[PDB]
């Protein structure tokens, strides 16, 4: 989500995907492993924050018949203090979790990219904006070999090396 200047609004298939254009047409298919990793991490955050405290608090005030003014002002004082504390905790918690979520997704995207880069070793070259310029024309089944991590790192090597 950095130098990948924008997202693909048509990729309703998953979080991350491959979109290729070689000679045998067009391609756009999502990747399952990285998407599932991010989904499981965010799911972990959600399941951890959604929580029911088994701690029970009883009444201490009285809404119908106001208690003595001194003890009432001490009670109100304490309740307002605890309210301040929990407001702060909620604010900071939400902000921090959001930061780590965004940076988490960016990290997963970077991992996907780096792995695909290392999968093809000198068979293709880097361009600038998250694409890989192929120097040997790779058909659709070869792209699918790149996707499911089966593309060979040498059986197309010198052919693309001389180019």
């Amino acid at each position: 989500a950095g130098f990948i200047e924008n997202g693909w609004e048509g990729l309703i298939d998953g979080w991350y995907g491959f979109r290729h254009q070689n000679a045998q047409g067009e391609g756009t298919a999502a990747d399952y492993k990285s998407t599932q990793s991010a989904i499981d991490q965010i799911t972990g955050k959600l399941n951890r924050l959604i929580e029911k405290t088994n701690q029970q608090f009883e009444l201490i005030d009285n809404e119908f018949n106001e208690v003595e003014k001194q003890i009432g002002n001490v009670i109100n004082w304490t309740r307002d203090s605890i309210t301040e504390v929990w407001s702060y905790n909620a604010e900071l918690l939400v902000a921090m979790e959001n930061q780590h979520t965004i940076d988490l997704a960016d990290s997963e995207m970077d991992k996907l990219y780096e792995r695909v880069k290392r999968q093809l070793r000198e068979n293709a070259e880097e361009d600038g904006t998250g694409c890989f310029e192929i120097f040997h024309k790779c058909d659709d089944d070869c792209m699918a070999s790149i996707r499911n991590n089966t593309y060979d790192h040498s059986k197309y090597r010198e052919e693309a090396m001389q180019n």
């Binding site: 989500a1 990948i4 200047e5 924008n6 997202g7 609004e9 990729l11 998953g14 979080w15 991350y16 995907g17 491959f18 979109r19 290729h20 391609g27 991010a38 965010i42 959600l46 924050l49 959604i50 929580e51 029911k52 405290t53 088994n54 701690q55 029970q56 608090f57 009883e58 009444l59 201490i60 009285n62 809404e63 018949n65 208690v67 309740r79 309210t83 929990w86 407001s87 905790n89 909620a90 604010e91 939400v94 902000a95 921090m96 979790e97 959001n98 930061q99 979520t101 965004i102 997704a105 960016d106 995207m109 996907l112 990219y113 695909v116 998250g130 694409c131 890989f132 790779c138 792209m143």
Partner: protein
């Protein structure tokens, strides 16, 4: 081959450590605002006191006759509830209320006070049943003849059980000193109450008050808790509302104050006067005085947690 991330046209704005208003793919709420305007009592033993005040269940005015030995997991107080029929007040009332809310109900037991040489059937026009009645669990101790004297009397009761007993007596403050001498005879009247943790003694303060429920006299309601195998002693001589039966706590419960309707269709553990908070979120913004097992109250009305990635559209 190229590789990228997904996006949407209409994102959701959240806040982070760095920015305020970052657009993300999906987000969820962390502050519950939805309320159920009913007292969700499904699966719980509920006692709706209605016009009966909580403390009244210990003394027994008419409106509490059907609550003298209740048993509950959830006790609901109502604004129309009245603790007294004859005008009076409870000393340390809120403490006794907080005791009775988590008591799980009460269990009466006769204290066995027999009187020799006085009358014992006082009544008034306010505490009304068939005709002029009185507090059910109490006995208005007077003098025999319209206008006699009160013999210096001494009674005592030992708690023969394993839990602390609840002892409640009264002090009559008559409309005048002539009426006090009419009911209990002239001379100073002293009410002494003693035990192992208790000193005290009291005496009356006759005089005119505001006409509440028709009468101008008042009744002080005092109470203590007898420990097991501990005895309580009353040395009195007039202006005395004697206890007939003592109270024992049943178990454990929770007391709430509310003005909404009971409902056995929904389940809930967090209650306030406006209804029930049925939620799994960690925070809430409905009532800071909510009781039970609740999310923590916060001042903010909304705090959005990001469940998706950064939304960068074309």
């Amino acid at each position: 081959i190229c590789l990228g991330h997904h996006a949407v046209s209409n994102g959701t704005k959240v806040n982070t450590l760095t920015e305020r208003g970052v657009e993300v793919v999906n987000a969820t709420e962390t502050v519950e605002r939805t309320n159920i305007p009913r007292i969700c009592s499904k699966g719980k033993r509920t006692v709706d006191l209605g016009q009966c005040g909580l403390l009244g269940t210990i003394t027994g005015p008419p409106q509490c006759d059907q609550f003298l030995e209740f048993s509950a997991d959830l006790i609901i107080e109502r604004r129309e509830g009245s603790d007294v029929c004859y005008p009076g007040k409870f000393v340390n009332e809120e403490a006794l209320r907080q005791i009775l809310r988590e008591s799980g109900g009460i269990d009466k037991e006769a204290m066995g006070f027999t009187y020799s040489g006085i009358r014992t059937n006082g009544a008034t026009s306010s505490c009304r049943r068939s005709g002029s009645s009185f507090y059910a669990e109490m006995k208005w101790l007077l003098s025999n003849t319209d206008n006699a004297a009160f013999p210096q009397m001494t009674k005592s009761y030992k708690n023969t059980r394993k839990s602390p007993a609840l002892i409640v007596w009264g002090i009559h403050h008559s409309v005048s000193t002539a009426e006090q001498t009419k009911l209990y005879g002239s001379g100073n009247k002293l009410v002494t109450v003693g035990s192992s943790n208790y000193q005290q003694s009291f005496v009356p303060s006759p005089g005119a008050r505001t006409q509440v429920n028709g009468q101008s006299g008042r009744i002080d309601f005092h109470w203590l808790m007898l420990n097991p195998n501990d005895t309580v002693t009353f040395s009195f001589n007039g202006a005395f509302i004697a206890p007939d039966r003592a109270s024992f706590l049943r178990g454990k419960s929770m007391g709430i104050q509310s003005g909404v309707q009971v409902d056995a269709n929904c389940e809930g553990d967090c209650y306030h006067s406006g209804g029930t908070i049925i939620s799994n979120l960690p925070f809430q913004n409905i009532d800071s005085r909510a009781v039970g097992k609740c999310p923590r109250y916060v001042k903010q009305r909304s705090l959005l947690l990001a469940t998706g990635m950064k939304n960068v559209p074309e």
